[PDB]
Amino acid sequence: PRYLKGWLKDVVQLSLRRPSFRASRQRPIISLNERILEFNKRNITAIIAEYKRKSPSGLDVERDPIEYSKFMERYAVGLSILTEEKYFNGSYETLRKIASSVSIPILMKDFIVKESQIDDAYNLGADTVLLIVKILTERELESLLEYARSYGMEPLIEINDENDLDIALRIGARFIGINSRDLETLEINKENQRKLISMIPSNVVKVAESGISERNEIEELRKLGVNAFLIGSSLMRNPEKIKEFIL
Numbered sequence: 001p002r003y004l005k006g007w008l009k010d011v012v013q014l015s016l017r018r019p020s021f022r023a024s025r026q027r028p029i030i031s032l033n034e035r036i037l038e039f040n041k042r043n044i045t046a047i048i049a050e051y052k053r054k055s056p057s058g059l060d061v062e063r064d065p066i067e068y069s070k071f072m073e074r075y076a077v078g079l080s081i082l083t084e085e086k087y088f089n090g091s092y093e094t095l096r097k098i099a100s101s102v103s104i105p106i107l108m109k110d111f112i113v114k115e116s117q118i119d120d121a122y123n124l125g126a127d128t129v130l131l132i133v134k135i136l137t138e139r140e141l142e143s144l145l146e147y148a149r150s151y152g153m154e155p156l157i158e159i160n161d162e163n164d165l166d167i168a169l170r171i172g173a174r175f176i177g178i179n180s181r182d183l184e185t186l187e188i189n190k191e192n193q194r195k196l197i198s199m200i201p202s203n204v205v206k207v208a209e210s211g212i213s214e215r216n217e218i219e220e221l222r223k224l225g226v227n228a229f230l231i232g233s234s235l236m237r238n239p240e241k242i243k244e245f246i247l
C-alpha cells in the first residue's frame with residue numbers, strides 16, 4: 001500500500017491480515033458495468049444501492065440486510081455491500097447471505113490491498129470489486145486489476161483527485177467511480193467531483209459516489225455524462241427514497 005496516516009493507515013493494516021474465506025461459488029458472474037450500459041440505453045436511472053450499518057462519519061442504523069436487498073432489487077441496477085469490519089460493521093457472512101438471495105450484480109466494498117481479498121469476493125458470490133487508487137501504488141493497482149479480470153470481473157476504480165485519474169487512465173481502467181468524499185479527512189467536495197467527471201474519456205462507464213440525497217442532484221449529474229450513482233446513507237436511513245430517485 002501507499003504511505004498512509006490516521007484511520008486509513010489502520011484499516012489498511014486490518015486488511016493485510018484479513019483471513020481468506022473458503023467456499024464454492026454457485027452462480028456465474030453477472031457483469032455490473034455491462035448492466036449499467038443497458039439501463040442507459042433503456043433510459044432507466046441506474047442506481048447502485050449500498051448496504052452499510054455504520055460509517056466513520058456517523059451513520060448508525062439497524063436494518064435487515066436480506067429484506068433491504070430484496071426490496072432494492074426491484075429498482076437498483078446493482079448492490080454494493082460493505083465487508084469492512086471495524087469501521088462499517090460489515091462481514092463476509094452478510095455478503096454471502098445477500099448473494100444467495102438476489103440475482104442482480106453485487107459489488108463488494110472494502111479496502112482491497114492483496115489478491116486473497118479478490119478470491120474472497122469471488123468465492124463469496126460478489127460480481128465485481130472496488131479498488132481505491134489513493135491507498136495503492138501504481139504497480140499494486142495494475143496487478144490487482146489484472147487479477148480481478150482473470151476471474152472475469154471489471155473492478156470499479158475509485159478516484160478523488162487529478163493524480164488518481166492520471167493513474168487510472170494509464171493502467172487502462174474502463175469503470176471509474178468519482179468519489180466526492182476524501183477518505184482521509186471525510187470532507188465532501190461536489191465541485192472537485194464535477195471537474196473530474198468532465199475530464200473522463202466518454203467511453204468509460206462513470207459512477208458518482210457519496211453524499212447524494214436528492215433527485216435534483218441525480219438529474220444534474222446525469223446531464224454531466226455520469227452513467228450510474230452509488231448511494232448509501234440516504235437509502236439506509238430511508239429505503240423508500242429509491243422510488244423518488246428512480247422517477
Ligand SMILES: O=C(O)c1ccccc1NCC(O)[C@H](O)[C@H](O)COP(=O)(O)O
Nearest residue numbers: 055056057183209210211230231232233
Ligand atoms: O461511506 C462513508 O460514510 C465513508 C466515511 C468515511 C470514509 C469512506 C466512506 N465511504 C465512501 C464510499 O464510497 C461510500 O460508502 C459510498 O460512495 C456512499 O456514500 P454515501 O451515500 O453514504 O454518502
